[PDB]
Design a binder for this molecule. Structure first.
Ligand code: HEB
Length: 396
C-alpha cells in the first residue's frame, strides 16, 4: 500500500528514509495524509522547482475548506500560504518594503547583541546544558520580538500557540481551535497597538505603509503577520539547533568554521541545505488536469513538494548525503522556490552567519554532551522536524 505521512525518522536530524525511497522509484508518489485523504508527493530537484513555480498548483485552493487539512493555520486565515495571484503579490510587495536593504543593515548590530547575550548565558552555565533551551530558543524569540516591536516575553506566549497552528496530527482537535483563537487575539492586539503608536520595528513600517496605501484589509494584514510569526520563530530555531547537531556530530565540520570564520557564510548555505525545518512543504491543490514527470494529476488533487528531498538529490549535488560546509557551488532551494519562496532569506542568512561565527569563535571545543543516537524529535505530528533538546558541553 501507499506510505502514510508523517514519515518515520530513525535519525531525527536527518530526512526520513521514505524520501530517498520515493525519489529513486516514483517522482510523483501517492501518500496517505493523517486525515485519510491521498496526496501526491514530488521529491526530485527539477520536479520540485517546476511544481513550486507552476501556478496550477495553488495555495489558495489548498486553503479552501473542502480541501483536505494539513496545517490548521492555512485554512483558518488569509495567510501568505493561503493565497495566490495579484493578492499574494501585493502582500509580498508590502512585506518586501519592510524587509528592505536598509532594514537588514540596521538589524546586523541588533542580531549581534542578541547572539552575544545568549552566548553569555551559555558561558555562565555549568555544562552539560540544553543548548536549545539556553541559546537558540531565546535567540529565535528575541529576534521575532524585534521584528514585532514587542517584549521577548510576549513572543514566548505567541510561540506556545505556534505548535497548534502547525500541528499535522500532534495536538487534539479541540485544543487547536482554542490555541488558535488565543494566537489570533494576540496578533490582532499587537497590530492595533502598533497602528495607534507605531515604533521602530518591521511590523510598524508595514502597518503604516499599508494604512497609507490602503491595499490590504486588517484581516489580510493579520493573516500575513500570522504567517510571519508561525514561520519566523520555530524554523530558525530548528535549523540552528538541528544544524548545530549535524556540526557537532560531523565534528570535523564544526572545526572548519573554527579554523576560518570567514567561511561561515558558505557553511550557512550547507547548513540550510542539509537541515531543513520540515519534511515536506505546505499543501498545494491542482486546479487543472496536469502531467508532471510522466504522471497525470486530475484537477483537485492535493500535491506536496519536498525541498528536504530535493536538496539531497544526487542529480543536483555530488555526494548529497554528506555534510560539507565547504561545498561550492551549492545551488540549493532551502529557502523555497516560486512565488512563495521565503521573504526572509536575506535576513535569515545574515542571522545564521552572525550566530555561527560567534558560537564557533567563543566555543571552539564545544561537543555533544550525550551520544548523537540519543536525540529525539520534538513532535512527530508537527510540521516542524525540530528536535527535543541538544545537550552540549565544553571544557571548564
Ligand atoms: C521572519 C519571518 C521568517 C523567517 C525568519 C524565516 C526563516 C526561514 N524560512 Fe521562511 N517564510 C516566511 C517567514 C520567515 N521564514 C513566510 C511568511 C513564508 C511564506 C511566504 C509566502 O507564502 O509567500 C516563508 C516561506 C518559506 C518557505 C516556502 C514554504 C513553501 O513554499 O511551502 C521555505 C522553504 C522557507 C524556509 C525558511 C528557512 C530555511 C528559514 C531560516 C533558516 N520559508
Amino acid at each position: 500500500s501507499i506510505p502514510t505521512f508523517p514519515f518515520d525518522r530513525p535519525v531525527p536530524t536527518e530526512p526520513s528514509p521514505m524520501l530517498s525511497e520515493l525519489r529513486n522509484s516514483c517522482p510523483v508518489a501517492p501518500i496517505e495524509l493523517p486525515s485519510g485523504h491521498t496526496a501526491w508527493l514530488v521529491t526530485r530537484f527539477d520536479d520540485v522547482k517546476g511544481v513550486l513555480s507552476d501556478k496550477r498548483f495553488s495555495c489558495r485552493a489548498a486553503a479552501h475548506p473542502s480541501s483536505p487539512p494539513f496545517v490548521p493555520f492555512v485554512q483558518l486565515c488569509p495567510s501568505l500560504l493561503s493565497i495566490d495571484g495579484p493578492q499574494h503579490t501585493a502582500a509580498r510587495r508590502l512585506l518586501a518594503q519592510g524587509l528592505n536593504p536598509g532594514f537588514i543593515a540596521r538589524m546586523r548590530p541588533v542580531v549581534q547583541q542578541i547572539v552575544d547575550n545568549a552566548l553569555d548565558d551559555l558561558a555562565a552555565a555549568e555544562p552539560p546544558v540544553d543548548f536549545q533551551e539556553i541559546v537558540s530558543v531565546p535567540i529565535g524569540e528575541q529576534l521575532m520580538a524585534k521584528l514585532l516591536g514587542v517584549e521577548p516575553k510576549t513572543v514566548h506566549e505567541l510561540a506556545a500557540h505556534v505548535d497548534a497552528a502547525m500541528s499535522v496530527c500532534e495536538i487534539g482537535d479541540e485544543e487547536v481551535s482554542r490555541r488558535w483563537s488565543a494566537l489570533c487575539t494576540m496578533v490582532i492586539d499587537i497590530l492595533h497597538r502598533k497602528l495607534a503608536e507605531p515604533g521602530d520595528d518591521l511590523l510598524s513600517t508595514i502597518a503604516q505603509a499599508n494604512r497609507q496605501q490602503s491595499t490590504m484589509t486588517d484581516e489580510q494584514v493579520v493573516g500575513m503577520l500570522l504567517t510571519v510569526v508561525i514561520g519566523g520563530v520555530d524554523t530558525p530555531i530548528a535549523v540552528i539547533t538541528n544544524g548545530l547537531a549535524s556540526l557537532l556530530h560531523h565534528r570535523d565540520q564544526y572545526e572548519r568554521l573554527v579554523e576560518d570564520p570567514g567561511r561561515v557564510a558558505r557553511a550557512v548555505e550547507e547548513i540550510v541545505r542539509f537541515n531543513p525545518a520540515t519534511e515536506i512543504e505546505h499543501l498545494r491543490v491542482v486546479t487543472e488536469d496536469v502531467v508532471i514527470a510522466g504522471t497525470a494529476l486530475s484537477a483537485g488533487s492535493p500535491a506536496f513538494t519536498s525541498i528536504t528531498s530535493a536538496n539531497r538529490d544526487s542529480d543536483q549535488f555530488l555526494d548529497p548525503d554528506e555534510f560539507d560546509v565547504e561545498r561550492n557551488p551549492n545551488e540549493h532551494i532551502a529557502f523555497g522556490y516560486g512565488p512563495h519562496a521565503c521573504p526572509a532569506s536575506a535576513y535569515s542568512r545574515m542571522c545564521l552567519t552572525t550566530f555561527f561565527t560567534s558560537l564557533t569563535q567563543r566555543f571552539p571545543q564545544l561537543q555533544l554532551a550525550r551520544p548523537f543516537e540519543d536525540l529525539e524529535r520534538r513532535g512527530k505530528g508537527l510540521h516542524s522536524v525540530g528536535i527535543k533538546e541538544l545537550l552540549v558541553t565544553w571544557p571548564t
